[PDB]
Amino acid sequence: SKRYFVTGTDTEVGKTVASCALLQAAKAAGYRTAGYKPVASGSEKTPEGLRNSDALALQRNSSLQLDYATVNPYTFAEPTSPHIISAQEGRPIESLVMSAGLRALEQQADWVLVEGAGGWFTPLSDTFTFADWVTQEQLPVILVVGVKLGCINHAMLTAQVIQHAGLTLAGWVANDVTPPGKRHAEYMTTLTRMIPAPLLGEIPWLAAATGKYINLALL
Amino acid sequence: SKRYFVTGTDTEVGKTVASCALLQAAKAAGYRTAGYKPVASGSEKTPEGLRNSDALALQRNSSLQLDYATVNPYTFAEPTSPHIISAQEGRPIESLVMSAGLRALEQQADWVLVEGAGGWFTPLSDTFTFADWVTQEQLPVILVVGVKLGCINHAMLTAQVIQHAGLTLAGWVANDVTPPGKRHAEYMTTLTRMIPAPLLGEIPWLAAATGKYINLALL
C-alpha cells in the first residue's frame, strides 16, 4: 500500500478538506482508498457513541465501505489536546493500537491516507508526540498550508523539522482559507520557492467535489 | 551591552506587549534601555513620514529619549511580508544597515531589545530571511507564546529550529491572548515541560504597566 500522513501549518487550516480532495483524486485514479484518523477530539454523542465530524468526512470519502471505529479508534468529546483529555478520562493512547489500526486498513486498501490531529508536534501523552509515531512508522508527509499572513513562517518551520527527522516531505497543498486578497499571487510564488517538495494543487475558497484541484501525478 | 532578539509563535500573539513588559522590567532593574525594530510594515502617514505603532510603543518604552528612525530604519506602509513590499517599492532591506543600526544603539544603551517582524522565518529578500540576520548577529532569543489551542505545536517548532541553528533560546514569555479558559493550567504545565528555556513570566489578558509580570532574574 501507498501510505501518506497529512499534517497542517496550524489547527484551522482546512486539513480535512485537503484530505477529502486527496481521497477523491486517488479514487478517480483507480485506487481502493481508506482514510484513517487514529486520534480525534471534539466529538458529538450519538446512539452509537461519540463521533467526530472530520473522521466522518474521511469515512464517507473512502472508496471502501468502512466502520467508524476502523477509521477512528480513539474518540474524545472535548476539543482540546489529546494528551490532556486522554489523562483526564483514564484512556491511554497506545502506539501499538494506532499501528495495528493502520495494518488492518492495509488489509483492504491499497492507498491509505492518515490524518493526524492538530499540527506536527501534538502531544499524545507526557512522553510521546504524534511526530514520534509518524517517525516510527516512516510515513511520507503531505503538508497542508492555509494561505494567509503568517503561513510562510509556519510552512518553513514544519518543513525543516520533518526533514531534520529524516522523513520525506512528499508535497504540499495550498488551501485558500479566505476570499481572494491583494498579495495572493506573491504568497503562492514565495511558498513554491521555499517549500522543498512539489505543490500538489490549490483548493479555492469555498464557504465538496474537490479532487480536480489535486495533481496525483506529482505524488 | 546585553542584547536579546524577541520572536513570536504566530503574527498576532501580542509580541510587542511582551517586548514593552521586558523593557519596563529592565528599566526597573537600572539598565539604560533601547528598543529596536529594524523592519516594520503596516504603517500610518504623518507630517514626518510613515510611522508604525509597534515601533512607537518600543520608542516610548525605552528609557533613553530616541528618534524614531533610530528605533525603526525600514518602515513600509502596507501590512504584508517585508520582502514583497520591499521589492514593490524598490527599497532593498540591507543586512549592513540593520547591523549598523544595532551598533548605533549600543553606543548609548546597555540593555537592547530587538523585535523582529512576524515569526521566525519572515523573508526580507528572495535570498535572505530574518533568521539569517539573527544567526549572523548571534543574538540570544526570547520566544513569546500566545496561549491558545495550537500553540504547543508552534512553540515546539520554533524552539527546535532555533536550537538547530546553534542559537541560545534565552527564555519564553506566556501572553494570555484570550480570557481564562478551561485548560489554561494544563497548557501552561505542558509548555513549561516542553520548551527548553526558563519561563520568564505570564502576562494576563488585558483588553500598560506590565513589567511586574516579568522575572528578569531568569535572563
Ligand SMILES: C[C@H](N)[C@@H](CCCCCC(=O)O)CC(=O)O
Ligand atoms: C504585517 C505583520 N503585522 C508583520 C509582518 C508579517 C509577515 C508574515 C510573513 C509570513 O507569512 O510568514 C509586520 C510587522 O510586524 O511589522
Ligand SMILES: C[C@H](N)[C@@H](CCCCCC(=O)O)CC(=O)O
Ligand atoms: C481540537 C482540535 N481541533 C484538534 C486538536 C488540537 C491540538 C492542539 C495542540 C497544540 O496546542 O498544539 C483535535 C482534532 O483535530 O481531532
